[PDB]
């Protein structure tokens, strides 16, 4: 079979730059090869095909060339609608392949995110569990580390995080911690505080509280 | 392939394996490479 | 309009099967190859399985091979994949793409037409509505600066889960993060939203959350403590 390698994985680039993401198949395909575009949830859209042939309807400021067994696909001029996964495909033979996906992002000056932390509510502990919030709103780049401390305790294995899809208008992006304890443990402990480091910081930003209080 | 036979001056027959009786049409699953070559009224078959 | 629209995603148990559907419109259906591919999320798109023309020269990734069959019923204008001993592992969206014929070879254009997807979730977890717990505003800082409030949807299963806040009325500052798979295998995530800290009290806050597996409906006023 084929492999295809896609490379860049990711990339960031500023409006109106050039970008090209390249895509290496294990074995010559010859001109079999075709790109597509994703956005978020979005089925993918085809761009390019037999290498170098435009899709109706697609904006001319992508192209791609290929010879041998090494294809590029290039973008012009990066406009904020081009965010997406790219990924090439041989058709050459079967099974046909996908790349890994080169994901695009547009490259916006450096924002420090607010920090926000939230305690669970009375409600929730009526449950099992307790619930702790931290988020992170309208940072760049993506990029960006939480820590977790339960009086001035790391914690581990106890947390998970999500990231949204890069903002429209901001081209930021926002991320939630979510710290989750037994009730019991929860009573156990006064203080919990979230540790946020990132590029946009000169210092660390730690927000906290207070379990009573 | 033919309406009669004339006279014969040889005839083979060979195994009773099956074929691929249906049309398909997707990744190729196998090989056959074939020599052709007659030298000498032999008729030299090579295959893999 | 060329359009191709999958039905038939769900939640599925191990073992299971399903078919999912996709109607096709805009063009003649007859004469041109379809195909399935899924993309399931931590991993990429994988192509799935392709029909000819004809109909009977069919494709498939190794994977699927006793489990899917691709069908397509041509007066129906539908193509089909009935799915066998599902697994875990083939959670993902499929999509129905209109796919070039493989006799162009060197000059293959690939598939020119994409559906929207169809989910699907093989998982043992059983369908459940999800809680909803305020997340109060809470910032030490002097007011007038802003404020961040949202709701915590959690231990909802299968996916998906619709989040609006005052029924559409907010939607600047507005993140929905995407859910996470948590270890008990349910579903979690929040809703937030920045808002001025002079808003709080003045404006009412009612997270809107809709999980339609479930079949539930939950509106969540979120007031500071």
Same mark, same amino acid.
């Given at each position: 079979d084929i492999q295809m390698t896609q490379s860049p994985s990711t990339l960031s680039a500023s409006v109106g730059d050039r970008v090209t993401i390249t895509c290496r198949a294990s074995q010559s395909i010859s001109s079999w090869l075709a790109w597509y575009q994703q956005k978020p949830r979005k089925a993918p859209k085809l761009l390019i095909y037999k290498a170098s042939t435009l899709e109706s309807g697609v904006p001319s400021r992508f192209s791609g060339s290929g010879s041998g067994t090494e294809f590029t696909?290039?973008?012009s001029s990066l406009q904020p609608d081009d965010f997406a996964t790219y990924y090439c495909q041989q058709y050459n033979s079967y099974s046909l392949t996908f790349g890994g996906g080169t994901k695009v992002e547009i490259?916006?000056?450096?924002?420090?995110?607010?920090?926000?932390?939230?305690?669970? &509510?009375?409600?929730?502990?009526? &449950?099992?569990?307790?619930?702790?919030?931290?988020?992170?709103?309208?940072?760049?780049?993506?990029?960006?580390?939480?820590?977790?401390?339960?009086?001035?305790?790391?914690?581990?294995?106890?947390?998970?995080?999500?990231?949204?899809?890069?903002?429209?208008k901001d081209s930021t992006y926002s991320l939630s911690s979510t710290l989750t304890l037994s009730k019991a443990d929860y009573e156990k402990h006064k203080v919990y505080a979230c540790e946020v480091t990132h590029q946009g910081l000169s210092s660390p930003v730690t927000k906290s509280f207070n379990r009573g209080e | 392939?033919?309406?009669?036979?004339?006279?014969?001056t040889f005839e083979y027959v060979s195994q009773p394996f099956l074929m691929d009786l249906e049309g398909k049409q997707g990744?190729?699953?196998?090989?056959?490479?074939?020599?052709?070559?007659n030298i000498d009224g032999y008729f030299k078959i090579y295959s893999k | 309009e060329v359009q191709l629209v999958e039905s038939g995603g769900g939640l599925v148990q191990p073992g299971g099967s399903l078919r999912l559907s996709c109607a096709a419109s805009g063009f003649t259906f007859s004469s041109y190859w379809m195909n399935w591919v899924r993309q399931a999320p931590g991993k990429g798109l994988?192509?799935?399985?392709?029909?000819?023309?004809d109909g009977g020269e069919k494709y498939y990734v190794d994977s699927v091979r006793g489990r899917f069959t691709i069908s397509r019923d041509n007066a129906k204008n539908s193509l089909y994949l009935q799915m066998n001993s599902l697994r875990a592992e083939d959670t993902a969206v499929y999509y129905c793409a209109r796919d070039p014929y493989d006799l162009y070879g060197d000059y293959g254009g690939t598939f020119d037409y994409w559906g929207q997807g169809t989910l699907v979730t093989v998982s043992s977890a059983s369908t459940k509505g999800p809680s909803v717990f305020?997340?109060?505003? @809470? @910032?030490? @800082?002097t007011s007038g600066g802003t404020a961040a409030l949202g709701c915590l949807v959690k231990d909802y299963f299968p996916e998906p889960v619709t989040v609006s806040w005052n029924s559409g009325a907010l939607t600047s500052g507005v993140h929905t993060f995407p859910a996470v798979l948590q270890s008990s295998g349910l579903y979690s995530l929040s809703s937030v939203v920045t808002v001025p800290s002079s808003s709080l009290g003045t404006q009412t806050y009612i997270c809107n959350v809709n999980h339609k597996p479930s079949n539930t409906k939950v509106d969540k006023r979120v007031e500071p403590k």
């Open positions: 696909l290039t973008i490259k916006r000056t450096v924002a420090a995110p607010s920090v926000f932390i939230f305690p669970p &509510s009375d409600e929730q502990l009526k &449950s099992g569990t307790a619930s702790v919030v931290c988020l992170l709103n309208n940072f760049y780049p993506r990029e960006a580390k939480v820590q977790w401390k339960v009086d001035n305790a790391l914690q581990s294995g106890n947390s998970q995080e999500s990231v949204t899809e890069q903002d429209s | 392939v033919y309406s009669s036979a004339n006279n014969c990744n190729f699953k196998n090989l056959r490479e074939f020599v052709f070559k | 994988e192509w799935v399985a392709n029909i000819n023309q305020p997340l109060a505003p @809470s @910032s030490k @800082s």
